[PDB]
Paper text:
In contrast, DEAD box protein 41 (DDX41), a member of the helicase superfamily 2 (SF2), is unique in that it can recognize two different types of ligands, double-stranded DNA (dsDNA) and CDN45. DDX41 consists of two RecA-like domains (i.e., DEAD and HELICc domains), which are conserved among DEAD box proteins. These domains have several conserved motifs, such as the Q motif and motif I, which are both essential for ATP binding by the DEAD box proteins. In this work, we determined two different crystal structures of the DDX41 DEAD domain in apo forms.
We determined the apo-form structures of two constructs, residues 169–402 (DEAD402) and 169–399 (DEAD399), at 1.5 and 2.2 Å resolutions, respectively. In contrast to DEAD402, the crystal structure of DEAD399 contains four molecules in the asymmetric unit, and their N-terminal regions adopt two different conformations. In one conformation, the Q motif is located away from α3 and motif I. Helix α2 is rearranged to form two β strands (β1′ and β2′), and residues 169–183 are disordered. We hereafter refer to this conformation of the N-terminal region as the “open form 1”. In the other conformation, helix α3 and motif I adopt similar conformations to those in open form 1, while residues 169–209, including the entire Q motif, are disordered. We hereafter refer to this conformation of the N-terminal region as the “open form 2”. In these models, the Q motif, including Ile201 and Gln208, is distant from the modeled ATP in the open form 1, while it is disordered in the open form 2. Moreover, in both open forms 1 and 2, motif I forms part of the extended α3 helix, which sterically clashes with the modeled ATP. Consequently, the structure of the ATP-binding site is completely rearranged in these open forms, and thus they do not seem to be able to bind ATP. Therefore, these results suggested that the closed form represents the ATP-bound state of DDX41, while both open forms 1 and 2 represent its nucleotide-free state.
Author numbering: 184 to 399
Write the structure that this text describes.
Amino acid sequence: KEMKFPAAILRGLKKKGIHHPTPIQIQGIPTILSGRDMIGIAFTGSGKTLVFTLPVIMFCLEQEKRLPFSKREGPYGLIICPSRELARQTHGILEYYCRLLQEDSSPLLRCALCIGGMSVKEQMETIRHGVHMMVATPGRLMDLLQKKMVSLDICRYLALDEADRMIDMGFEGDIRTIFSYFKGQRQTLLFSATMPKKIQNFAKSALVKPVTINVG
């Protein structure tokens, strides 16, 4: 409730005609920080980044200000994608905003990519040094979790992007497996282009008392 976006965001949102936005609401529309799980039907890139990515980045920045003496590897937030290409571009966007918000007087948030087809070079440089946000595909993530190579203990925010596509592609078992590695409570956002029965049921499994934003 006391959270504010810094001036680069507030400036750029104002150019678009968005006045008085906060990390908990965008012109009265809730984000993932307002205490509810969410189902987001037919969102574009830009809508997803207002309701999920920017508000979670702010959460990361606030947590960084008073850390415990003995630190934990994050991430604080996780985005699960259907594909390598989509994970990489989603990961490039997060890095873009992470760079934008450092230059508003701070140190740099680090985003991990967790997908197949990463060289060992790419695998080391992402995971070791710090991880605040992670972007992954379901198979690779599951395998990292089971091999105890990644931890979800402080991960509060989860987005499932294109869950319809993920389920179509046969990743549902893999996502449920990932659900079982959350020890604490998560706030979960589900994105989908459409909402047939198949996904309605997966959402019942995956979410608790969700708010629904449907722009189809």
